[PDB]
């Protein structure tokens, strides 16, 4: 008949974007809007929920209008998916339809005290005590402790709970709620596994944990899968219902990192993806039976297509300062001026010439979690230059990623075929080359990199019949979107030495608790 | 009645200078001449003895001619003092009055094998086997080991020793020999305390040591004080005699660090000097009985005025990278552009906010000697900037001196009353401030900065009758050349946290082999 279009709302930490994809999985229109990073106290971070909602409406409004110019024919989007910064938690009132306060963000640290209380009083000192249930350890990261914090610290959230009018939700839940004009109150499986309130295997709330954590189960959305009807766009903000033309269904919702796992087509077990952002997130499909880590890695839902579809599980590892380390060398240290210079400088020298740079600015994590680890450089000499330091920082990222994959490989009980990679630092050739060398697998860099956004459109398109199967979805990707492989070149000696040098380096990073 | 003037030959590693001073201790005329750095093998360094000799003659000539033009009251130089690069060793012939080879320089590593032979066979493994005699460990620096090397590897030397036509001399001896036409074969006690052949307690050659090191006592100069008649300039190379016009006595000889100690007026026990060069050298006057270190510091003669006058001893500490650290951050790391900016950037932050930079690029020295230590930075966060890193560098210079000082304080059973500072990094006002807070004593910075050259002018002039006593020297100086006094200015708790962070940091710097 004619060209069909699916919409993705990509709700991130620093901004909101809306992207329209056509049926050949190509993004044809985009708009982006930043929202304000509220830091009321040191280590705290909150976002304005209404600002996020509007950013989303505006993005939808402009992308549509721009597409209308490119294709005077376009009329309707078949369905819209949402992908979102996870763990961030919105508190709101069922009837005023308004937020009770600003949403604490996933990396916010206000809940540190509640976090000690939980592991001591509830876990007897074991921070992993609920890990066979949720997949997670206790930390400031997860939704639940944000909910507790709002209950304990914000009068409005208190009354509203008493009155039986309190809604909690992650950003997918808030968005779907406000988009539908208060009609939908749902969350998908990937997002709900980041709350600390969901049994990972059954995919249902945990009465046990909501009791002990004292979150009143009536405050929580219905859980669903990543691909099925959530509701429709009813709303009029920024004139969106009118910008869409027919009633538009919402048919995809999925956490950003899992979305990137899905948009990179990591459909079978052992298939993995790393997103280099600020920021590194690595996820591996472990298959249909959930696996639990003996190394501190997270167990989480990878994705579930359909009310009745199979739930695939993931192991997840993170690095905090990846693209942040490059920004730091640039903006904080004046080691170079324009992002271009980073790779050029690191390839200017043959190697790091005895130095290690451990950029644990925010602590360690991964499979060696250490909060007191700090940014460290060792081994310098009067021959050491900034180009060694830059290459060192790039090596450290890849070596942390190596320890993570190495942990995953043992926890899942399987191997890594290859690593799909997206985000900023994957535009860095030297980074990818060192990474392949260490891992010893091929690394695939996608030309169309809007992968996180795509995963959401995939979920919504599959539900809406735009695509019929994972099979079709892959075949379209294979046809439409070229790739670039980076293979290992590491001569097996160089690799193993570099790891033991890095081993030693890690011993010198403990700084201050 | 008429203006009196004293001359100073300052024969350093990279060049030679002749500074004329008036009785106000003002420098009125200078001329500088470089000499070639012959580096025939890696780790090696030697100078052309004769090139050095003509450097000084020509310095004398031109400086004297310049002062006759610009000063009508100038008639003659009352006396000449020599200060020099210590340990650098010349072998020359008693009759030809020429050198048998170039002079290994203090930092030349050719004597390394002979150094391990000595500590293993004479020391029984203990490189300190002679420090209660010489104040020194076995090491590539000292003159004895350069002499042995020359007897072993240079035919003409071995031959000349054979014939009894051999002279050995540090640069002071060589200069005074050649300047006097060969009439004076003398050394000062400061330079002779760097040969490894002088018993510290008598200030005489140790027949025990010359035996064990197989140096014929017949090849060595007579030891004298720093201030007394050495000889007279008689040579006419470059017309010096003609220039000098009258007959001029050489009446000052003193190794370069002891001359900085003397030029900065450290006459009493507890007074110390630090030269902020590449490069840090700290010397403390410890009184009239030699004191020995439990921590690796060198014991030496500080100064002796008069033929058998009172001899003041000293303790010597060094750090390897100071000015070198500042150049490194500019040149290798791009942290700043002009040298101006270093103190500017370091000043724009109130503290280091946790980070420690130990710039042990070439190993650790001083009282925690470790050649495996490498340059290392601990405690960085994403709030850390170049400014904090600059600051931490400067702090680290001060911290290392504090360690050297505390160690000297213990060893000599005494406090530090003031530290007189000089060298390029002494113009860094913030560094000067951190060091005063850290030590808790006043830092004195002289405005007439030619302090190394002046110590030699003062030796010669005390002996010639220009200044009548040590007290007149101090009064003229206080009268004529302004000192800057820099006071302690912090809290004892900030001090103590800074020293605590530091000890910890040191613990993470081992890296090499």
């Amino acid at each position: 008949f004619t060209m069909k279009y699916v919409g993705s709302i990509d709700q991130g930490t620093t901004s909101t974007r809306f992207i329209i994809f056509d049926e050949r999985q190509r993004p044809v229109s985009v708009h982006q809007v930043p929202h304000t990073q509220h830091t009321p106290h040191p280590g705290w971070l909150e976002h304005d929920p209404m600002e996020i909602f509007r950013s989303a409406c505006k993005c939808m409004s402009v992308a549509i209008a721009k597409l209308r110019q490119k294709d005077a024919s376009f009329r309707k989007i078949e369905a819209i998916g949402i992908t979102n910064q996870r763990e961030t938690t919105v508190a709101w009132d069922r009837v005023t339809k308004e937020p009770l306060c600003y949403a604490p963000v996933w990396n916010d640290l206000r809940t540190y005290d509640i976090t000690k209380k939980v592991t001591a009083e509830l876990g007897g000192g074991d921070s992993m005590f609920a890990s066979k249930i949720t997949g997670l350890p206790v930390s400031t990261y997860f939704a639940a402790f944000k909910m507790r914090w709002m209950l304990e610290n914000v009068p409005a959230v208190a009354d509203a709970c008493r009155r039986g009018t309190l809604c909690f939700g992650t950003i997918d839940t808030w968005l779907m709620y406000k988009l539908s004009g208060g009609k939908a109150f749902v969350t998908d499986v990937t997002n709900a596994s980041r709350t600390f309130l969901m049994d990972l295997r059954t995919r249902k709330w945990s009465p046990e944990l909501c009791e002990k954590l004292k979150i009143p189960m009536e405050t929580l959305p219905e859980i669903r899968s990543n691909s099925e009807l959530f509701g429709y766009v009813e709303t009029d903000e920024c004139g969106v219902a009118a910008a869409l033309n027919e009633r538009t269904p919402i048919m995809g919702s999925i956490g950003d990192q899992q979305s990137a796992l899905f948009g990179n087509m990591c459909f079978e077990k052992g298939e993995a993806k790393n997103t280099y952002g600020t920021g590194c997130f690595l996820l591996m499909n472990v298959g249909e039976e959930a696996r639990f880590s003996k190394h501190g890695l997270l167990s989480t839902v990878g994705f579930q297509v359909g009310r009745d579809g199979p739930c695939y599980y993931a192991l997840e590892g993170a690095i905090a300062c990846a693209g942040a380390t490059v920004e730091w060398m640039r903006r904080n240290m004046n080691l170079f001026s324009h992002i271009t210079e980073c790779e050029k400088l690191a390839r200017s020298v043959p190697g790091t010439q005895g130095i290690v740079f451990v950029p644990a600015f925010s602590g360690l994590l991964a499979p060696y979690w250490d909060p007191s680890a700090r940014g460290t450089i060792v081994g310098m000499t009067l021959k050491t230059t900034r180009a060694h330091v830059i290459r060192a920082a790039l090596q450290a990222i890849a070596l942390q990623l190596n320890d993570v994959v190495g942990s995953m490989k043992r926890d899942a009980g399987l191997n890594l075929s290859s690593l799909r990679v997206d985000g900023g630092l994957s535009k860095n050739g030297l980074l990818m080359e060192i990474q392949a060398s260490l891992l010893g697998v091929d690394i695939l860099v996608p030309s169309m990199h809007e992968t996180t956004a795509l995963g959401a459109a995939l979920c919504a398109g599959l539900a809406a019949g735009v695509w019929t199967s994972l099979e079709e979805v892959k075949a379209v990707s294979r046809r439409e979107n070229s790739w670039k492989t980076v293979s290992p070149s590491g001569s097996a000696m160089e690799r193993e030495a570099m790891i033991a040098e890095w081993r030693e380096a890690l011993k010198r990073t403990k700084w201050a608790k």
Side-chain angles (χ1 to χ4, degrees), chain A:
Chain A
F1 206 130
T2 335
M3 179 47 104
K4 296 193 286 280
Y5 290 110
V6 54
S8 184
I9 293 168
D10 181 9
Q11 212 304 286
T13 306
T14 60
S15 70
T16 305
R17 312 150 84 216
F18 185 66
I19 310 209
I20 311 180
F21 286 91
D22 71 7
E23 37 182 62
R24 300 155 67 190
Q25 305 180 172
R26 267 211 173 270
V28 293
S29 202
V30 52
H31 194 229
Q32 171 203 145
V33 174
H35 57 291
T36 295
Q37 309 298 311
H38 288 108
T39 52
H41 293 297
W44 294 38
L45 180 61
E46 56 199 15
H47 294 150
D48 186 348
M50 284 298 309
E51 189 185 11
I52 281 168
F53 174 59
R54 288 181 182 118
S55 295
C57 296
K58 289 142 64 171
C59 284
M60 270 161 44
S61 220
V62 179
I64 285 163
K66 279 201 281 159
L67 216 207
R68 196 142 279 161
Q69 296 251 118
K70 299 263 218 174
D71 177 26
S73 188
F74 145 82
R75 34 187 287 178
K76 57 172 321 183
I77 285 166
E78 298 308 296
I80 280 169
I82 294 152
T83 182
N84 59 291
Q85 44 155 337
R86 298 175 299 164
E87 296 103 13
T88 301
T89 299
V90 178
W92 83 93
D93 203 311
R94 218 159 204 195
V95 296
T96 76
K97 301 187 193 298
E98 306 303 309
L100 276 340
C101 53
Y102 287 168
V105 177
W106 57 276
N107 73 134
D108 169 68
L109 301 163
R110 72 189 76 188
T111 54
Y112 181 85
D113 288 328
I114 279 137
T115 250
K116 287 345 216 197
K117 264 206 45 210
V118 166
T119 124
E121 293 177 17
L122 285 184
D126 182 13
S127 85
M128 294 295 282
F129 84 108
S131 54
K132 290 321 203 109
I133 313 173
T134 62
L136 309 169
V138 187
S139 53
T140 43
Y141 204 173
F142 307 110
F145 315 109
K146 283 160 216 298
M147 292 162 185
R148 202 55 243 161
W149 191 92
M150 290 170 296
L151 282 168
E152 291 175 22
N153 297 76
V154 181
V157 188
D159 323 61
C161 186
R162 216 156 307 109
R163 308 188 320 241
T165 60
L166 169 61
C167 290
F168 282 127
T170 51
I171 292 284
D172 63 316
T173 306
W174 173 240
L175 236 23
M176 289 183 302
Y177 175 85
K178 283 297 282 171
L179 248 17
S180 69
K183 288 193 166 105
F185 177 40
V186 275
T187 169
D188 64 275
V189 292
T190 60
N191 273 303
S193 71
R194 317 294 292 193
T195 49
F196 211 77
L197 298 184
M198 193 202 78
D199 179 276
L200 204 251
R201 279 123 124 190
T202 44
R203 283 161 274 113
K204 313 180 190 184
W205 303 118
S206 187
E208 203 208 330
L209 270 151
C210 319
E211 171 196 24
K212 307 198 206 140
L213 283 168
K214 75 227 91 168
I215 266 90
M217 279 205 46
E218 336 111 30
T219 58
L220 302 167
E222 191 197 331
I223 306 184
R224 301 161 94 115
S225 72
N226 296 308
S227 204
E228 80 187 52
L229 186 64
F230 294 88
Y232 292 85
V233 178
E234 259 101 20
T235 184
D236 41 347
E237 265 272 6
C238 302
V240 293
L244 313 176
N245 276 118
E246 272 62 79
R247 290 230 316 170
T248 314
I250 299 153
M251 310 197 90
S253 177
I254 187 166
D256 52 8
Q257 309 299 325
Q258 285 90 329
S259 176
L261 189 63
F262 197 84
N264 267 316
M265 329 261 154
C266 292
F267 300 143
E268 7 254 1
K269 69 191 196 167
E271 302 196 301
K273 115 260 161 16
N274 183 244
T275 301
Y276 295 87
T278 276
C280 180
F281 289 101
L282 199 152
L283 284 78
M284 173 197 283
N285 194 326
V286 298
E288 312 183 56
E289 196 158 18
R291 233 115 275 200
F292 294 94
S293 171
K294 298 296 164 262
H295 307 277
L297 299 175
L298 316 183
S299 294
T300 198
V301 189
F303 60 83
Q304 166 168 223
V305 209
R307 211 95 205 81
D308 259 29
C311 198
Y312 289 83
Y313 290 97
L315 283 160
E316 174 173 338
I319 116 99
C321 317
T325 296
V326 162
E327 279 309 305
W328 174 90
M329 289 188 290
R330 166 172 130 30
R331 224 81 71 107
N332 283 49
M333 295 283 298
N334 205 55
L335 296 203
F336 65 95
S337 258
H338 326 103
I339 203 161
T340 347
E341 297 178 53
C342 177
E343 159 168 38
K344 197 37 86 218
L345 269 154
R347 335 180 76 122
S348 283
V349 296
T352 50
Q353 311 219 236
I355 75 164
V356 190
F357 181 14
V358 186
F361 294 103
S362 298
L364 247 15
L365 262 82
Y368 23 58
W369 188 77
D370 188 343
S372 73
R374 290 288 175 274
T376 315
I377 308 186
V378 293
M380 300 184 298
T381 70
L382 271 185
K383 263 82 164 61
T384 296
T385 68
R386 55 172 181 163
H388 309 90
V389 170
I390 291 158
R391 194 195 180 99
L394 283 178
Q395 283 188 22
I397 296 173
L399 274 152
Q400 282 170 101
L401 257 9
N402 192 52
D403 291 314
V404 173
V405 166
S407 282
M408 266 178 205
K409 294 206 330 203
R410 307 188 272 214
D411 286 333
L414 46 68
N415 298 294
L416 190 78
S417 50
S418 87
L419 185 71
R420 301 185 165 100
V421 300
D422 53 48
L425 300 191
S426 76
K427 290 279 176 207
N428 187 303
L430 177 65
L431 187 48
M432 303 304 82
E433 285 172 15
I434 306 165
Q435 191 72 81
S437 302
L438 286 165
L439 295 178
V441 306
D442 286 306
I443 271 135
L444 272 59
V445 197
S447 68
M448 198 272 312
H449 40 252
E450 293 294 306
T451 180
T452 300
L454 188 68
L458 299 183
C459 292
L462 289 158
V466 172
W467 303 286
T468 39
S469 68
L470 303 182
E471 219 41 58
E472 188 189 357
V473 161
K474 286 200 284 147
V476 167
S477 169
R478 179 274 151 122
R479 177 184 325 112
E480 294 295 356
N481 270 307
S482 73
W483 306 75
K484 174 176 161 54
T485 54
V486 178
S487 69
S489 62
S491 54
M493 259 317 290
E494 295 275 69
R495 199 177 304 162
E496 199 74 298
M498 193 197 291
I499 283 171
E501 194 189 38
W502 164 261
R503 270 306 148 239
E504 283 304 313
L506 286 177
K507 299 209 216 309
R508 287 150 176 82
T509 61
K510 311 180 188 294
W511 197 239
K513 153 64 196 157

